[PDB]
Amino acid sequence: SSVQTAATSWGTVPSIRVYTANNGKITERCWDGKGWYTGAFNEPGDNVSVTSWLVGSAIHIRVYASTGTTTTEWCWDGNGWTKGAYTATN
Amino acid sequence: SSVQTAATSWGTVPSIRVYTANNGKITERCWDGKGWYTGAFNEPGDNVSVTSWLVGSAIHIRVYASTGTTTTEWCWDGNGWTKGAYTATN
Amino acid sequence: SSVQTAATSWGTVPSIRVYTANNGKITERCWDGKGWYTGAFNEPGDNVSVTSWLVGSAIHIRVYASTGTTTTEWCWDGNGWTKGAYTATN
């Protein structure tokens, strides 16, 4: 299996975030208009998806990181990554 | 291979949908502001992607479900899932 | 491994683009309101993700194509595909 990516963007600049799962680790590369840099997001995963929405001045990002049959939602809401309430079943 | 996900979101609440392909079946988990629940979407797939757009009061969702070399588009347009016109070639 | 897809959409029509990685090649299917057609995008990849944003009359698309541990960003900015500045590390 090749590395696996997920991408999202917001605004008009725009800002872009690209998440890459490589050998069980997801890392984050960021564009905010002038140069790519490495973002804070660094969590385990073989598979990744992402969605985002911009409300006011805060970007809200949800990254779904999967290893085996376990999917962990990671949340950015303008001030730090947290593990969210998402579960795959009740 | 780990489970594989795809995510989309809309509005300001927001609403989120997360599709998970697990052992050949795609299922759907939904957030509309207070609690995750299991959505109606339940179709075959080893791979999934999604996109969506909100027009008026109706969310329009397109889920691309793949098994082997066959990709099936599933459509939500506010009142039920249907298999759409998408084909991978003419 | 089944084929792998990524999808994006824009506008109200809407326009949809679906990228499919199949046997190391990514191809593109397009909807702009009346019929699916094959788009110009044709580049190597085992994995694909996409994001897009509409500014003025130009759609801007970013397709992240991965083979092995190499991820190539492809950019549409209204007048042709180009390989962008994205790198996975500095």
Side-chain angles (χ1 to χ4, degrees):
Chain A
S1 181
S2 302
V3 300
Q4 190 262 326
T5 69
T8 193
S9 56
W10 65 88
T12 52
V13 175
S15 283
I16 310 166
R17 300 288 182 276
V18 178
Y19 301 89
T20 300
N22 183 5
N23 197 30
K25 289 130 149 97
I26 300 158
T27 56
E28 177 189 47
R29 293 284 281 172
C30 311
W31 174 273
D32 299 313
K34 195 171 166 184
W36 289 91
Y37 66 95
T38 296
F41 189 77
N42 193 327
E43 297 299 342
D46 283 328
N47 175 261
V48 64
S49 66
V50 64
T51 187
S52 70
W53 63 95
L54 185 60
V55 191
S57 46
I59 186 65
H60 298 267
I61 309 169
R62 298 293 179 271
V63 173
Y64 298 91
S66 299
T67 300
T69 56
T70 304
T71 301
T72 303
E73 174 189 56
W74 291 98
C75 306
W76 179 272
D77 300 285
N79 42 70
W81 290 98
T82 68
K83 188 187 282 150
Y86 175 86
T87 56
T89 44
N90 285 329
Chain B
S1 181
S2 302
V3 300
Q4 190 262 326
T5 69
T8 193
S9 56
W10 65 88
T12 52
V13 175
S15 283
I16 310 166
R17 300 288 182 276
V18 178
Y19 301 89
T20 300
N22 183 5
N23 197 30
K25 289 130 149 97
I26 300 158
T27 56
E28 177 189 47
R29 293 284 281 172
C30 311
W31 174 273
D32 299 313
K34 195 171 166 184
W36 289 91
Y37 66 95
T38 296
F41 189 77
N42 193 327
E43 297 299 342
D46 283 328
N47 175 261
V48 64
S49 66
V50 64
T51 187
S52 70
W53 63 95
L54 185 60
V55 191
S57 46
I59 186 65
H60 298 267
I61 309 169
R62 298 293 179 271
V63 173
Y64 298 91
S66 299
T67 300
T69 56
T70 304
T71 301
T72 303
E73 174 189 56
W74 291 98
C75 306
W76 179 272
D77 300 285
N79 42 70
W81 290 98
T82 68
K83 188 187 282 150
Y86 175 86
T87 56
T89 44
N90 285 329
Chain C
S1 181
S2 302
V3 300
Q4 190 262 326
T5 69
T8 193
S9 56
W10 65 88
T12 52
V13 175
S15 283
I16 310 166
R17 300 288 182 276
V18 178
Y19 301 89
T20 300
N22 183 5
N23 197 30
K25 289 130 149 97
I26 300 158
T27 56
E28 177 189 47
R29 293 284 281 172
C30 311
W31 174 273
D32 299 313
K34 195 171 166 184
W36 289 91
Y37 66 95
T38 296
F41 189 77
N42 193 327
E43 297 299 342
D46 283 328
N47 175 261
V48 64
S49 66
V50 64
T51 187
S52 70
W53 63 95
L54 185 60
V55 191
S57 46
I59 186 65
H60 298 267
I61 309 169
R62 298 293 179 271
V63 173
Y64 298 91
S66 299
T67 300
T69 56
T70 304
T71 301
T72 303
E73 174 189 56
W74 291 98
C75 306
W76 179 272
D77 300 285
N79 42 70
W81 290 98
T82 68
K83 188 187 282 150
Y86 175 86
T87 56
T89 44
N90 285 329

